[PDB]
Design a protein around this nucleic acid. Sequence first.
DNA 1: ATGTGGTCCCCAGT
DNA 2: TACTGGGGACCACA
Lengths: 64, 73
Amino acid sequence: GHIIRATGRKDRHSKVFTSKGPRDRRVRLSAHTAIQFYDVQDRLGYDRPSKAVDWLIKKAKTAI
Amino acid sequence: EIVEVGGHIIRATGRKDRHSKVFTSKGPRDRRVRLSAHTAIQFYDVQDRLGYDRPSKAVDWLIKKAKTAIDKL
DNA sequence: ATGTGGTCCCCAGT
DNA sequence: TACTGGGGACCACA
């Protein structure tokens, strides 16, 4: 897993390196997925959504 | 404006974006989130490996494939 | 300086 | 003709 350091002086957010190349680290959820996702996020009591998808990925480790 | 449909889904009556937010147990939330470098790397991996075009589907799949944990919360 | 979470403004597409 | 997915920028922060 890698990172790509920003080039511009306007946005300094890092991108990540995936199978399809540099990707921006934001995702958009659809309205039904948002509500279910945020269900989980508020249940675990996590402040930042990203910690909720770390949880959702630990579990599901049987993705393989 | 509020619509009941799922749950409660707020329609922005603004004008530079008709993008709609969702009403959560902690108020109006945006449907766009910023994954940490650490998370994004693992999240996109499973998106690629499922071949899903749009990454919202991947979160749908995660939740699908993890209700065995979600209910006991 | 160089990243961070998070969201605004807005383009192109569903 | 209403909403969306995502890029580009940006405020406060660290």
